[PDB]
Short mmCIF file of C-alpha atoms in Angstrom, two decimals:
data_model
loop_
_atom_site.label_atom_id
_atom_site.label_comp_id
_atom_site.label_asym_id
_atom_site.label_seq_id
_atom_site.Cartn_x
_atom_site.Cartn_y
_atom_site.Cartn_z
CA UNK A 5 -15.08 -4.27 19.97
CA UNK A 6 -11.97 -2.85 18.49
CA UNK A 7 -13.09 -2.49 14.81
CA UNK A 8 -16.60 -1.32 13.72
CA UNK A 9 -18.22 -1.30 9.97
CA UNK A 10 -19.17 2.08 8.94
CA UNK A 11 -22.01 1.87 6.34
CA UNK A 12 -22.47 3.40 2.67
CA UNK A 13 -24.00 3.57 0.14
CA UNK A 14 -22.11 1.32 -3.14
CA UNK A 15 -21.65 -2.46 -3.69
CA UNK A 16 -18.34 -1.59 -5.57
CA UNK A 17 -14.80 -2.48 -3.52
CA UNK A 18 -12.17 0.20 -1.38
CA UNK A 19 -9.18 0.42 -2.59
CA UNK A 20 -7.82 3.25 -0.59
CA UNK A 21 -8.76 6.17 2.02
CA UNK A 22 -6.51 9.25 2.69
CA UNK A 23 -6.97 12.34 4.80
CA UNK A 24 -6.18 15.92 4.35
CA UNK A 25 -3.52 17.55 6.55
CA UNK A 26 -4.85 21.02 7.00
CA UNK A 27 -8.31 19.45 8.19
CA UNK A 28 -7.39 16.04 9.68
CA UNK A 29 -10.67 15.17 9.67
CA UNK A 30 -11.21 16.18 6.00
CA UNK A 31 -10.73 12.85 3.90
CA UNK A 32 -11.30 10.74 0.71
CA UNK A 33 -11.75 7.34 -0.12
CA UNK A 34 -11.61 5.56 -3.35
CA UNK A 35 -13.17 1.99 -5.43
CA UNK A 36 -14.36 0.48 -7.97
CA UNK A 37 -16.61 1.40 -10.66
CA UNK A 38 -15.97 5.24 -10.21
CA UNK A 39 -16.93 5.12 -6.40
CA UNK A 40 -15.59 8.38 -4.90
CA UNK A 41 -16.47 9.05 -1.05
CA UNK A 42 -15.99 12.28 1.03
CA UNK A 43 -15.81 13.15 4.69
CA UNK A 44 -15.64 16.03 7.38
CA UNK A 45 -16.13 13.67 9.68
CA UNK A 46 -13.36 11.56 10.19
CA UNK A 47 -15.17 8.82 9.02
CA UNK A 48 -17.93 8.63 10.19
CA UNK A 49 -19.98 9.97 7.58
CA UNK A 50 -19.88 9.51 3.78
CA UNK A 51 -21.62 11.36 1.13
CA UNK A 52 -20.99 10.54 -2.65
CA UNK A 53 -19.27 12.92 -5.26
CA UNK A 54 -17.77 13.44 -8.76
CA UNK A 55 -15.07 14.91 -11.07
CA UNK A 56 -16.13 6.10 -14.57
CA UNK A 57 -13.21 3.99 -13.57
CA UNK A 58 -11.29 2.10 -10.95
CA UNK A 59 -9.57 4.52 -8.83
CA UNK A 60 -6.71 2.60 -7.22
CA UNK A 61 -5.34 5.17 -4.34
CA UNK A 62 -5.20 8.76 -3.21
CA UNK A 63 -2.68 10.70 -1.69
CA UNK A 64 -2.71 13.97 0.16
CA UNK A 65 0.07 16.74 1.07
CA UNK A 66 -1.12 19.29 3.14
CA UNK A 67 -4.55 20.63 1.02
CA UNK A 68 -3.45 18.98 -2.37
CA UNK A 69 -4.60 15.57 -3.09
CA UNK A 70 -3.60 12.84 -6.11
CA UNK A 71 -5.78 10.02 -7.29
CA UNK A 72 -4.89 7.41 -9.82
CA UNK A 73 -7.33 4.81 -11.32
CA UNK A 74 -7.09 2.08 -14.12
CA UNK A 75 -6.69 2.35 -17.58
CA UNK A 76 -4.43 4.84 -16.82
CA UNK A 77 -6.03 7.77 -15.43
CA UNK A 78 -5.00 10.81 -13.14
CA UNK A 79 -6.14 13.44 -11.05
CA UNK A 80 -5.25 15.91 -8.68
CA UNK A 81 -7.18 18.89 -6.66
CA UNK A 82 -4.93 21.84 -4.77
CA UNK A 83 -8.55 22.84 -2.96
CA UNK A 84 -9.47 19.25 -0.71
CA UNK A 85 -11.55 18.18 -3.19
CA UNK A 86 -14.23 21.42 -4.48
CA UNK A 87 -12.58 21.14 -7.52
CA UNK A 88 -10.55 18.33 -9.74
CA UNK A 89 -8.06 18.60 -12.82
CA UNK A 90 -7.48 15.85 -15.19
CA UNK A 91 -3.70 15.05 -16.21
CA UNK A 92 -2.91 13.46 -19.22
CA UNK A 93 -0.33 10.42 -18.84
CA UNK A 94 2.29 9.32 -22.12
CA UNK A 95 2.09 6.32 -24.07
CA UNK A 96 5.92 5.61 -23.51
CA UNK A 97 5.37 6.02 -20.01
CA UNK A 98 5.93 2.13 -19.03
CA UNK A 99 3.16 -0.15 -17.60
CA UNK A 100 0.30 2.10 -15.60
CA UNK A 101 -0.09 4.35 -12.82
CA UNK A 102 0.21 1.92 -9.73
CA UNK A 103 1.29 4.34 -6.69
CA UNK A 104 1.27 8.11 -6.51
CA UNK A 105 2.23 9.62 -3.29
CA UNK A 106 1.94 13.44 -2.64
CA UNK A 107 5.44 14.94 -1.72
CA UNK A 108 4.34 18.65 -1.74
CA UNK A 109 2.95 21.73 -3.30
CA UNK A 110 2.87 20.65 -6.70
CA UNK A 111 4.85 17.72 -6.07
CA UNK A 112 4.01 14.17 -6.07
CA UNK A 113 5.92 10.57 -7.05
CA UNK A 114 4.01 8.40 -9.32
CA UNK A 115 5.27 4.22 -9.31
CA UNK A 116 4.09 2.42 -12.56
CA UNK A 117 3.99 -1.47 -12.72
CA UNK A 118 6.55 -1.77 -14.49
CA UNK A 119 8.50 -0.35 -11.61
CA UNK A 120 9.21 2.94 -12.80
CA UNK A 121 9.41 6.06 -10.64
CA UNK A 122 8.55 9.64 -11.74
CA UNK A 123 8.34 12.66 -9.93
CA UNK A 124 6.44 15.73 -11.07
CA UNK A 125 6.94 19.23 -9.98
CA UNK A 126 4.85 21.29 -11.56
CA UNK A 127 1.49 19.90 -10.84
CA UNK A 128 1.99 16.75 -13.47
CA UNK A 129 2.92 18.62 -16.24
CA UNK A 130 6.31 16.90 -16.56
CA UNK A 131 7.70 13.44 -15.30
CA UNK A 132 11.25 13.56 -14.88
CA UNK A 133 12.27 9.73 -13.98
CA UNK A 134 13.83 8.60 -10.95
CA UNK A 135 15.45 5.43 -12.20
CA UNK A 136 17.95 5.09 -15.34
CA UNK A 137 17.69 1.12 -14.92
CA UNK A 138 14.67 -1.04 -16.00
CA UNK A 139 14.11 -3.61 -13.86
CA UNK A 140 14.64 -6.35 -16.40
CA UNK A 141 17.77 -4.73 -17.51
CA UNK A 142 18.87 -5.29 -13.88
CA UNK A 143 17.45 -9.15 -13.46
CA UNK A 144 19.40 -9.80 -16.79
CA UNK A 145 22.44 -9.07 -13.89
CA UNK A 146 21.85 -10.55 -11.06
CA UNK A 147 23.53 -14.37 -9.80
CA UNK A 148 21.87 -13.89 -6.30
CA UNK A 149 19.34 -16.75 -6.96
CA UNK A 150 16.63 -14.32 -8.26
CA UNK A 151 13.84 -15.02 -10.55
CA UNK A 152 16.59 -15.47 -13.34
CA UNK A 153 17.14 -19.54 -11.90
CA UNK A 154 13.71 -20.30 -11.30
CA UNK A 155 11.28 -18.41 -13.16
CA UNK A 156 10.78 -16.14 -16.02
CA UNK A 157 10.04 -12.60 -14.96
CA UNK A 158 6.70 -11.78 -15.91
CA UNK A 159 7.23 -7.51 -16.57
CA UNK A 160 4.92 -6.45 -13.83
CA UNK A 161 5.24 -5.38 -10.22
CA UNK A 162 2.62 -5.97 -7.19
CA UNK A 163 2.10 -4.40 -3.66
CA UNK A 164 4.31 -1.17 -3.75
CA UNK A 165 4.67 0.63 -1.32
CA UNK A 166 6.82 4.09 -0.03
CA UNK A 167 8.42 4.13 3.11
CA UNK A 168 8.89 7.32 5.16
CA UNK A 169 12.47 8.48 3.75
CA UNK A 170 11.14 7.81 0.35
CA UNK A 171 12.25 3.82 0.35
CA UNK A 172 10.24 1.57 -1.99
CA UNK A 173 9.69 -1.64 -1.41
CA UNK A 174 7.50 -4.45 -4.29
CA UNK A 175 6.97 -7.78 -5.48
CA UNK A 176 7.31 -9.17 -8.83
CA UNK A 177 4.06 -10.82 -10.39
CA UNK A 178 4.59 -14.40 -9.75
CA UNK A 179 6.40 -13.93 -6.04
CA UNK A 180 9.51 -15.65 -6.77
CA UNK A 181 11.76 -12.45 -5.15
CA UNK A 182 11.09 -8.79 -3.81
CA UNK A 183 12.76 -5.38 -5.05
CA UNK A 184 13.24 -2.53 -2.83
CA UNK A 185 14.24 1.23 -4.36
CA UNK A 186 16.18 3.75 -2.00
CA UNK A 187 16.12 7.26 -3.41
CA UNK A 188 19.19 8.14 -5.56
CA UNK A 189 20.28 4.35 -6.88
CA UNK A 190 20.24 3.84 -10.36
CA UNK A 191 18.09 0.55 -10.02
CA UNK A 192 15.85 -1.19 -7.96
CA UNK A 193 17.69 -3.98 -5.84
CA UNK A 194 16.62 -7.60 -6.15
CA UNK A 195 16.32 -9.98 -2.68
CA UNK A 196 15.85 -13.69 -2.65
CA UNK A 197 12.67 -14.92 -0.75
CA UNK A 198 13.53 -17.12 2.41
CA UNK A 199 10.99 -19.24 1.83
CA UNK A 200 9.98 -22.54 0.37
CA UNK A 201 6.94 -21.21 -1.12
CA UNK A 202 6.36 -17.92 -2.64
CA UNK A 203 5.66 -14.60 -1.49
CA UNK A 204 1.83 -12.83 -1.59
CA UNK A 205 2.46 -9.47 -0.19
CA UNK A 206 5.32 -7.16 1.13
CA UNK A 207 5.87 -4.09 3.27
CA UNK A 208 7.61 -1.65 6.06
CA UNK A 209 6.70 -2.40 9.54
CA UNK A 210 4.47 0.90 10.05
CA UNK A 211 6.21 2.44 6.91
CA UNK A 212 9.90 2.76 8.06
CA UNK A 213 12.13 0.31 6.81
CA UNK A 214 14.45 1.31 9.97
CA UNK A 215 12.21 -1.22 11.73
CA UNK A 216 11.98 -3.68 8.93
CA UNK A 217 10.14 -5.49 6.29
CA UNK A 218 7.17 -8.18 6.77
CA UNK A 219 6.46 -10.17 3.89
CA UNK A 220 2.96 -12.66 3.63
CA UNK A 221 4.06 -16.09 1.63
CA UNK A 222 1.11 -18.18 0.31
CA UNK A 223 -0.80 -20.40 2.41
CA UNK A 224 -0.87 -18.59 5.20
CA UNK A 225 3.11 -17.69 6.06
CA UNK A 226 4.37 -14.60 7.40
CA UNK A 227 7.84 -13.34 8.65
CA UNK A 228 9.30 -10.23 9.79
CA UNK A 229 12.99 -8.93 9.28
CA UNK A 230 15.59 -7.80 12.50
CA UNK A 231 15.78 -3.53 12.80
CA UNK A 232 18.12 -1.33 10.56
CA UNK A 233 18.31 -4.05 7.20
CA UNK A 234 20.24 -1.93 4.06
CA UNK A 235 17.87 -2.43 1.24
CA UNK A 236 21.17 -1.71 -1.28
CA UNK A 237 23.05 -4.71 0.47
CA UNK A 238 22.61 -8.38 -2.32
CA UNK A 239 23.92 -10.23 1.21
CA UNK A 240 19.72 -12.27 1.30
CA UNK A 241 17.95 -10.51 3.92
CA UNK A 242 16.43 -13.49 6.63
CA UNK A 243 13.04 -13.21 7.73
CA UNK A 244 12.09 -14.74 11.28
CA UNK A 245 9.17 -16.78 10.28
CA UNK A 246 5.78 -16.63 12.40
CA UNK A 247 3.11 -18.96 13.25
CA UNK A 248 0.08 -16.76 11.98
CA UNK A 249 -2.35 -19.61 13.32
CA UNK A 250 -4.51 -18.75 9.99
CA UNK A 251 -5.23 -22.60 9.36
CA UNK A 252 -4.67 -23.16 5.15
CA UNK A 253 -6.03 -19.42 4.18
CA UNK A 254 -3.35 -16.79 2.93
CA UNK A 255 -2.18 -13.27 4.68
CA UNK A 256 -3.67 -10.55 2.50
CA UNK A 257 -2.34 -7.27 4.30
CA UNK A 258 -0.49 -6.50 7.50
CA UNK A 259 -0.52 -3.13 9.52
CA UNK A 260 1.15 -2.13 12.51
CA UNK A 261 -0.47 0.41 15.49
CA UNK A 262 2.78 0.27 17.01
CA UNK A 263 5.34 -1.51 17.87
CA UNK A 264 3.28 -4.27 20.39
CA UNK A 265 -0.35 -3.88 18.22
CA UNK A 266 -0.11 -5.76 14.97
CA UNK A 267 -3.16 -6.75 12.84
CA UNK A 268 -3.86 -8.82 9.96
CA UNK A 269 -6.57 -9.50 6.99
CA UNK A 270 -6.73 -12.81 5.65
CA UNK A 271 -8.72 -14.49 2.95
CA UNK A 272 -11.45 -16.68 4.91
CA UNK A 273 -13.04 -12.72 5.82
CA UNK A 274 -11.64 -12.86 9.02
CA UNK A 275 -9.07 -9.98 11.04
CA UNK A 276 -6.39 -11.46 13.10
CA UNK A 277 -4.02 -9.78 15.82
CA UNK A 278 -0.96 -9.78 17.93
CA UNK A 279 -0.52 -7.62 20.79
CA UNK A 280 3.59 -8.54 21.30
CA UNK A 281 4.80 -7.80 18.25
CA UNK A 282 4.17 -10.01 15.43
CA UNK A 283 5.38 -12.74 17.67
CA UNK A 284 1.98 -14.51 18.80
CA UNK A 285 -1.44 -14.53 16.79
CA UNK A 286 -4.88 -14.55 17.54
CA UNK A 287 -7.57 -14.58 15.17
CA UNK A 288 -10.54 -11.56 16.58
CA UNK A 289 -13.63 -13.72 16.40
CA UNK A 290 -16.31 -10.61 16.92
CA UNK A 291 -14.73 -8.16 13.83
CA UNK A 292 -14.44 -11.57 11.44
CA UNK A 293 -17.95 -12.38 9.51
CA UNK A 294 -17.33 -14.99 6.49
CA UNK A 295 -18.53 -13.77 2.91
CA UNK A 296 -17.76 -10.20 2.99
CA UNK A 297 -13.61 -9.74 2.06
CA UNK A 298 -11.03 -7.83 3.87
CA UNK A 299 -8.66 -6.51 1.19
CA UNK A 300 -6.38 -3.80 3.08
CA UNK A 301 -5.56 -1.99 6.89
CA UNK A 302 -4.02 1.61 6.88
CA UNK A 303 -3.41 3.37 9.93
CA UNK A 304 -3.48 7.57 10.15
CA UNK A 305 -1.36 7.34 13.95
CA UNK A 306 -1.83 4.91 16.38
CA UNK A 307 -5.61 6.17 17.13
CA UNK A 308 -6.63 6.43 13.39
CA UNK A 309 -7.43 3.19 11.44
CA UNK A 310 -9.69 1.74 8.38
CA UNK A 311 -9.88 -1.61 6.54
CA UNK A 312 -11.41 -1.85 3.46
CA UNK A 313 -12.52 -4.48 1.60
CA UNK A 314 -14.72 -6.05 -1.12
CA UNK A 315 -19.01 -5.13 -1.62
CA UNK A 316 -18.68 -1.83 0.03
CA UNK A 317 -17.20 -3.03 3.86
CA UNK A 318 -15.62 -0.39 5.56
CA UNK A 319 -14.05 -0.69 9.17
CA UNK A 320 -13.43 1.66 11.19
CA UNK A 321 -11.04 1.48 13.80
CA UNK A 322 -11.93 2.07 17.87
CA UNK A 323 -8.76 1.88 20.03
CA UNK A 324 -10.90 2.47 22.92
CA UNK A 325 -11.09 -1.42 23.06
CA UNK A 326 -7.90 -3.24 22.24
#
């Protein structure tokens, strides 16, 4: 039994679960309706704490840890957790807070949806941006068969996420294209889909885009890119599509162990894997149970794991068993 539902005490839904690097056992987790979890544990055990919103990720770098929630809201402690600051966000900063990531001692990267990128250095007193180029500025330029032919770009981003070397990689509202960001370009770089339909969610294959991209199109599809793909190059990246075997129900997160152990979320509550690649799939039939939703998988190493998902379900993950 390779995944195993650790119990607590909240209806409301995980959005995200990070862990201290001084005490890698020492971590936080993060929902809905101002749920905030802690653990010395490893995650085992959960007891809650305070400072209510919805708190949409948190971030760590070595004892300093970021949280962002919706409406905007920040927050960052440089002490695990004992004791947490709030940070005041500007009106003419563009959309809301949508990714932080922690880069440092008093250093973090915040993504907005709008697709902005802003760095901090002193603690989140300042934002100097990362990109000169609004993203709409940029789709007003594009001929590559972007959303600019089909559809009309709806100003929001989805599913962002930051590769190792500081790569970005998102999704525009309706699906219709992807945009990846590589650190020091002026704009993000729009990528036609390779699909018929469109695209649900997007990311790097265990969070290096030196091994490439897998993308989740709706209904169920799911490809993976070939090794070593230059996210600045407008020559359409191709995606080897996969038979996911997920019947009608849509992909809703992918995460890799390594480079043979692959796993999946998907919409009917169930967890399906691969264990050659993403080449073959299997659907797990003693980690799925129907009602309860599986929203998101996030690996700490190959012998760390979690899924989280909707009314409270947390799994924990037991590589003892794969």
């Amino acid at each position: 039994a390779a995944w195993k539902q650790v119990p607590l005490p909240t209806e409301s839904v995980l959005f995200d679960i990070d862990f201290s690097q001084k005490d890698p056992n020492h971590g936080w987790l993060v929902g809905t309706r101002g749920l905030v979890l802690e653990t010395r544990d490893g995650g085992e055990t959960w007891e809650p704490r305070a400072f209510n919103y919805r708190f949409s990720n948190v971030s760590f770098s070595g004892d300093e840890a970021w949280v962002i929630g919706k409406p905007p809201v920040m927050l960052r402690s440089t002490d695990g957790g004992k004791n947490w600051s709030r940070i005041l966000l500007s009106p003419k900063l563009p959309g809301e807070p949508l990714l932080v990531t922690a880069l440092g001692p008093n250093c973090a990267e915040m993504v907005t949806s709008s697709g902005a990128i802003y760095v901090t250095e002193n603690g989140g007193i300042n934002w100097k941006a990362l990109v000169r180029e609004t993203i709409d500025a940029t789709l007003n330029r594009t001929i590559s068969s972007g959303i600019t032919g089909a559809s009309y770009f709806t100003g929001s981003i989805v599913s962002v996420s930051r590769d190792v070397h500081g790569n970005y990689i998102a999704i525009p509202s309706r699906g219709n294209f992807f945009l990846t960001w590589v650190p020091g370009s002026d704009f993000w770089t729009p990528h036609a889909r390779s699909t018929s339909r469109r695209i649900s969610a997007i990311g790097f294959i265990q969070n290096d885009a030196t091994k490439g991209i897998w993308e989740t199109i709706r209904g169920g599809g799911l490809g993976f890119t070939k090794p070593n793909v230059n996210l600045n190059s407008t020559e359409t990246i191709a995606f080897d599509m996969v038979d996911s075997k997920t019947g009608g129900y849509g992909i809703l997160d992918v995460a890799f162990q390594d480079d043979r152990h692959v796993w999946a979320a998907v919409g009917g509550g169930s967890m399906y894997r691969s264990d050659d690649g993403g080449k073959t799939w299997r659907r797990d039939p003693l980690v799925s149970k129907v009602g309860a939703n599986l929203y998101k998988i996030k690996f700490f190493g190959s012998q760390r794991g979690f899924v989280l998902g909707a009314d409270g379900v947390l799994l924990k993950f037991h590589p003892e068993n794969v």
